[PDB]
Amino acid sequence: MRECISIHVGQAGVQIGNACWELYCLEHGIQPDGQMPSDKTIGGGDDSFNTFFSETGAGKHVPRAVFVDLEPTVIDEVRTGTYRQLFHPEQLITGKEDAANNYARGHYTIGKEIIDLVLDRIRKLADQCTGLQGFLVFHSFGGGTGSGFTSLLMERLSVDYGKKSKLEFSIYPAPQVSTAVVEPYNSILTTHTTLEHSDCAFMVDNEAIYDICRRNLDIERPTYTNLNRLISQIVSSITASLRFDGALNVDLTEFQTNLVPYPRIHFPLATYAPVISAEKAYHEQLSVAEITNACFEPANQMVKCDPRHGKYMACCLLYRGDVVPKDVNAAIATIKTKRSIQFVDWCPTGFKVGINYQPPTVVPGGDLAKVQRAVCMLSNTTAIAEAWARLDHKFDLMYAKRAFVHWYVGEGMEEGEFSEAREDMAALEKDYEEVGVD
Amino acid sequence: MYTFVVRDENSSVYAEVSRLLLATGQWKRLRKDNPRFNLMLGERNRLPFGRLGHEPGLVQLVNYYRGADKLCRKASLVKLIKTSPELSESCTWFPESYVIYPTDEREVFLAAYNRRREGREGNVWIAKSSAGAGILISSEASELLDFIDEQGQVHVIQKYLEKPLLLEPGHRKFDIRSWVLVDHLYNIYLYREGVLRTSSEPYNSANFQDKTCHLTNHCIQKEYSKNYGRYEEGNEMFFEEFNQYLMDALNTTLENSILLQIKHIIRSCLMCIEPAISTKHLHYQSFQLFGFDFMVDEELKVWLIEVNGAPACAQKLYAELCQGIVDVAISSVFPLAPTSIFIKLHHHH
Amino acid sequence: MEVIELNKCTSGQSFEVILKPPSDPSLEEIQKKLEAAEERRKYQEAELLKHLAE
Amino acid sequence: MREIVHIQAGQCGNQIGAKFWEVISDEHGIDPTGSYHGDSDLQLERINVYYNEATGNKYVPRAILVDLEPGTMDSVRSGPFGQIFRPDNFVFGQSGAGNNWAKGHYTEGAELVDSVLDVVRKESESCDCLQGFQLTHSLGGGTGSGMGTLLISKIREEYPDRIMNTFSVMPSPKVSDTVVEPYNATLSVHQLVENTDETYCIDNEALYDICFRTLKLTTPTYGDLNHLVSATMSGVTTCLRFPGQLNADLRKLAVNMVPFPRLHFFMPGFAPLQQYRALTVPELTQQMFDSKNMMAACDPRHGRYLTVAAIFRGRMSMKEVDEQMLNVQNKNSSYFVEWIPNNVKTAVCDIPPRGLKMSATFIGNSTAIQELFKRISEQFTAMFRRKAFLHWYTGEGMDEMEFTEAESNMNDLVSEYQQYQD
Ligand SMILES: Nc1nc2c(ncn2[C@@H]2O[C@H](COP(=O)(O)OP(=O)(O)OP(=O)(O)O)[C@@H](O)[C@H]2O)c(=O)[nH]1
Ligand SMILES: Nc1ncnc2c1ncn2[C@@H]1O[C@H](COP(=O)(O)OP(=O)(O)CP(=O)(O)O)[C@@H](O)[C@H]1O
Ligand SMILES: Nc1nc2c(ncn2[C@@H]2O[C@H](COP(=O)(O)OP(=O)(O)O)[C@@H](O)[C@H]2O)c(=O)[nH]1
Ligand SMILES: CC(=O)N1CCN(c2ccc(Cl)cc2)CC1
Ligand SMILES: CC(=O)N1CCN(c2ccc(Cl)cc2)CC1
Ligand SMILES: [Ca+2]
Ligand SMILES: [Ca+2]
Ligand SMILES: [Ca+2]
Ligand SMILES: [Mg+2]
Ligand SMILES: [Mg+2]
Ligand SMILES: [Mg+2]
């Protein structure tokens, strides 16, 4: 058994972390007090779920997680929330004033003064691990902390844990659920400095989650709770292989091996299905072929883009529930004859498939209906370069007039870091085009 | 009040569409860089589709289908017809063609060429590329290949129709231009009005050197031909006159003898690529106007020559056709405050 | 259409389908960056205090 | 615990400041004696932002009342909520400033400023984490204008990295007290260009027209004008004082509103302005963006919005709000700059102001504000070209050179606005 340490940075990372660990507890049968009746080894064990939970002598199952935010209002929801008893106080780290949506403030001004503390707390979790695999880092692109402090943390993690994999769950900025205008700056600044330090990153576009919540869950104006509960399902689907018995994606190193042939191109596209409203009278349970076909509909993707006009480099199908391999292949063949699936010529046109029999778990009293089978597709497509183009264009519009630049310079950042980070994103866009277009 | 942007100042068609939108007093034009728009009249090349459909609350529509180039590129079309199960097997309406680079079909072309030479058959081919105004018609294979190596872009060699239907008097070639509009729902609308672009020179099958009587392009006829505008004004014959001619000469009608095949060819091409370009379940909507170019041989069989993705229109038809665009393509998505000019080629989606 | 490496257990199974065959900055350097930004903040503030002093 | 320290200086500053504390005290359930008597916990969740907690569950505003003459502050101490203020936070002199910027900034004010800072220091030292400062004052008088800007300069010297915001009343010949107002306003504007992060420009002319034309007040009084200012000040601080999906301190708000350091002068607006009728969301959005509802006396159709923020208060359809906001922009995008993507932001708050089912507050960073500075600069130059009334200022130690510099500084500011309007 090899441990995974989860790190949640900023409001988005913390609240998504809160929603994931709630889901993990419900999936592994862990009560809010930390007790786990089905765990017959008390205060010890090397089970699959122990990759994410440690155990006290009193039988408490403690998440291998650290929560970091430069202001306390969001983490206090954890300290006093339903699962307050799961965490030791040292695992929840809060400053007193945030980065004000200013990457420079989160990375340099405030990051410089809190980084060593965070490393020390993370070190204490590493010292409980006999074979640490690596870290899962949750954060937003747009936040001053999620963007600025994360990139500093990622640089220091590469120094202190060189041989350890690092995976990201990144929230891509969407105007429909944001009141900030500088997020394009923070996104590009953080991607540039984090690029060489992240082995695999799953971007989630709030625009996509928002539309899925309005369309499939009939939520007129989704909140962050609605968004985070949905996002935690996808995250759970991705991390399930590390927490349950299985043979596919059994350690973080396997995510790069199966999804990232080229290191810089490490942003797989995530697709989830089905998302059924709980208020529905009673939906017809979808079949393996149907939910599989849904994985190639743009409306079920975590990042809105058109994969029909890109190239696939890898592809993982992760099924949870009543699914047998016979039904998967039947659905696959059917889809290859109808869909536009263009693979890169230097990659086999195949799909790695994983099936977990335990069906998707849902938070009682949530918006998501209990389904008998669900799938999450992880595919590395050049089509996701659309998201970089969109974001890079917004950066260009504001940077041509130096709008808001003074806020970053005032915090000690040099203006040259803007163009340096932008030119790196231009090279990243060129990499995708060299792999995708003919 | 709907907003639209213009990003192709050279579109004669959408210059009039934009002129009509502003006339309704309910459409407002914005700077070409303003992202807050409902309709985009986009550029022909490198249209940034990836930035469409991400403005909150804005229903965004564009006048191009992403991926239609597969149909409107010479070499792309040839590959599509050969590699598409919906077409290659029974595509009896597309002249034998081969993609030739200066993968490549050099050897396969020669195999079919030697077959024709050995079998006394008419072995005349025409080489062309998308980078042309650069066309060559020849019955010798050596010239066709040496003409492509001197250049530097991909070319297609296809069988030259040695038995074209010749109009009388004059004994002259011609081609048929059909305008087709595909809206956001992927309905296929065929403009009731087509045009024959005629050659004002007598067709001479014993001299492929003088390309004025073989190339029916409106520019080549108005430039190198000495009988321009003799029979019809601007070497353009419209369906009313052409239909009457077919009744007097061949005792047939334009609908039966030709239009049935045109409609079938338009449906075949568009239905084939529908799954790959449809915006039905996309975050933005697409429509596009297409210019299908056909040839008619002396057996009254219709041949598809190419499909233009950025076509122009006949001077006399701009008013009616452009109004039809606004009617079915734009106002259908953005309504304002007949006897349609189009023919709906129904089909299964 | 070939299935390979089928692994089965009580909680699920996994396999691979093939449709077609194919054809860092040190700790020191991070300190310098952080302290350089801090220095530029010190300088800019000194210029403000100098301005206010005038 | 993101505390804000409020300062009100001069006659105007203290009268508007008094009405502001009267309004929000009502919203937060605080009675004139400082005791809480509301019915909702939302009233106390962020109560420490503007109020200190004393013994016996008393809430005392974190406010400092400054003036060079006792008159106005004697009125506050005897007014409705006068008892609620901290006795030690009344700092005043006897000489007055004679509507003279030089007296408030250099002579009379300089003698009083150190004791004001002693009280500011005292309030800041008891702050868990100081968010920043806000100052209410006018620019056309002597104390609020001249001493107010001196205070800002000395606050910035001691708290260089704290946000400094002002609600600044701009003069107008229509509602003028003295002819030297253009002098005082121009001298102050230069101070604000340098030392404030955000300034809400409140134009007494706009307030007057709203009272005469829209509100149908035959003879408006300062009290009437101040009712609009109080209502506006409560709206802009609603997201700071109540819980909601906003959650943003002064610096985060300034970061997203100010693209260039010198262009930080906002045009505020309020709505609504046949009084019991229910106002639909379309009526809130149309009015709020209407010029006849703004207090900058500037026609937004003369410039372009760099950034726009809107706060809706009340139980309403947030879906319908977005539909109306996304309708105003997408139906008038010619007045928004296209090189700041998504520069129109909206926020909702469930707690409506007193006696209103719902309301909307508007905060605009518009280049049209240059017209307000053009009017001031024109009146300034007309007098300065003849050195009219200058002796009131050179008699206090000021030289003509300082006037020339202020003239140039504001004309630069106008030129800076004009280039971004193109
Ligand atoms: N999906 C999702 N997005 C969130 C959530 N919270 C914030 N965001 C998004 O994150 C971006 C704002 O950054 P934050 O994470 O809130 O800021 P931060 O990381 O705490 O950094 P600070 O500036 O110091 O507050 C916006 O795009 C929000 O839409 C959340 O709980 N779920
Ligand atoms: N295989 C073939 N047989 C007979 N004629 C042919 C032919 N290929 C091309 N032509 C002649 O060439 C003309 C059209 O050429 P083509 O369309 O390939 O070039 P082009 O695309 O630059 C003109 P446009 O796009 O405007 O139709 C027709 O008038 C036709 O007479
Ligand atoms: N809106 C409003 N404006 C005021 C008020 N009192 C004064 N003014 C304006 O402020 C200017 C006079 O400045 P004042 O505050 O009286 O001078 P100070 O006491 O020296 O700071 C003039 O432009 C007046 O129109 C008030 O109560 N409300
Ligand atoms: C004695 C005692 O209470 N404990 C348990 C909690 N501890 C802890 C420290 C850091 C981190 Cl990240 C996690 C947990 C310290 C030891
Ligand atoms: C105190 C201050 O700086 N301001 C200006 C910006 N504000 C704002 C309101 C709504 C939204 Cl969505 C965004 C920003 C509130 C008041
Ligand atoms: Ca155990
Ligand atoms: Ca590394
Ligand atoms: Ca004295
Ligand atoms: Mg935060
Ligand atoms: Mg062509
Ligand atoms: Mg006065």
Structure explained in plain terms:
This is part of a larger assembly, with chains A (438 residues), B (349 residues), C (54 residues) and D (422 residues). Chain A is 40% helix and 17% strand. Chain A is an alpha/beta fold. Chain A has three domains: 1-268, no CATH class; 269-383, no CATH class; 384-438, no CATH class. In chain A, the strands form three sheets. A six-stranded parallel β-sheet of chain A has the order 5-4-1-6-7-8, sandwiched between helices. In chain A, helix 2 links the parallel strand 4 (65-69) and strand 5. In chain A, helix 6 (183-195) crosses helix 12, helix 6 packs across helix 14 and helix 12 (385-399) packs antiparallel against helix 14 (416-436). Chain A is globular, with a radius of gyration of 21 Å. By secondary structure, chain C is an alpha+beta fold. Chain C has one helix and two strands. Chain C has one helix at residues 27-53; strands spanning 2-9, 12-20. In chain C, a hairpin with a 2-residue loop joins strand 1 (2-9) and strand 2 (12-20). The N and C termini of chain C lie far apart (81 Å). In chain D, the strands form two sheets. In chain D, strands 5-4-1-6-7-8-9-12-10-11 form a ten-stranded mixed β-sheet. A two-stranded antiparallel sheet of chain D has the order 2-3. With 422 residues, chain D is an alpha/beta fold. The longest helix of chain D is centred in the last third of the chain and has 22 residues, at 400-421. Chains A and C meet through helix 3, helix 5, helix 11 and strand 11 of A and strand 1, strand 2 and helix 1 of C. Strand 11 of chain A pairs antiparallel with strand 2 (12-20) of chain C, so a sheet runs across the interface. Bound molecules: guanosine-5'-triphosphate (GTP), phosphomethylphosphonic acid adenylate ester, guanosine-5'-diphosphate, 1-[4-(4-chlorophenyl)piperazin-1-yl]ethan-1-one (2 copies), calcium ion (3 copies) and magnesium ion (3 copies). Residues 10-12, 15-16, 69-70, 98-101, 106, 140, 142-146, 171, 173, 177-178, 183, 206, 224, 227-228, 231 of chain A line the site of guanosine-5'-triphosphate. Chain A: Its EC number is 3.6.5.-. Chain A: Its cofactor is Mg(2+).
